[PDB]
């Protein structure tokens, strides 16, 4: 559950990285002198690698979603266990109130 | 979710059953004392 969702979070961050690499590449090209042309090539390869693996991750996840889609609303649930747990907790609360009352009558008896 | 709620239910029921047994022993002592009181 955290796996595919964390993949989606990573692809969010890498879309940001793609835009920042676009911006950094045209930043270096706008310079009056741009000595680090090797670093320009590195930023260009970084940009294209970012776009390519963003495409790879999203295509893979659309494929995986195509494999496990059904168009049906999933008739499973967990309601009955929550109901039984609520009844158990209210049993405990009822016993707590009754124990408070018995202890209060014991304090009234011992108090005199 | 189901397994977690089942474990909570079982803990509550074990607490209640042990409470009932201890209260029952106290009730036995109190019944003996009250019914055998001279007054």
């Amino acid at each position: 559950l955290a796996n595919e969702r964390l993949r989606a979070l990573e692809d969010i961050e890498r879309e940001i990285g793609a835009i920042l690499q676009n911006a950094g590449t045209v930043i270096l090209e706008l310079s009056k002198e741009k000595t680090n042309e090797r670093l320009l090539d590195r930023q260009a390869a970084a940009f294209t690698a970012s776009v390519q693996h963003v495409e790879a991750e999203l295509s893979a996840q659309i494929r995986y979603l195509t494999q496990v889609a059904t168009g049906q609303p999933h008739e499973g649930s967990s309601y009955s266990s929550r109901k039984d747990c609520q009844m158990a907790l209210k049993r405990v609360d009822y016993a707590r109130l009754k124990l408070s009352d018995v202890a209060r009558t014991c304090e009234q008896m011992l108090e005199n | 979710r189901n397994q977690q709620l089942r474990t909570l239910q079982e803990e509550c029921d074990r607490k209640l059953i042990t409470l009932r047994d201890e209260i029952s022993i106290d009730l036995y002592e109190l019944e003996e004392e009250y019914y055998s009181s001279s007054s």
């Binding site: 907790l89 405990v92 016993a95 707590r96 124990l99 408070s100 018995v102 202890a103 014991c106 304090e107 008896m109 011992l110 | 803990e11 509550c12 607490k15 409470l19 201890e22 209260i23 106290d26 002592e29 109190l30 004392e33 009181s37 001279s38």
Partner: peptide, 27 residues
Amino acid sequence: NELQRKDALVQKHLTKLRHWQQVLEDI
């Protein structure tokens, strides 16, 4: 002696009740 015995029984019972309230509060 009946009075003192009744008070001893109720004191033991009251301590057990307070212990069980402290147990049942912690669920």
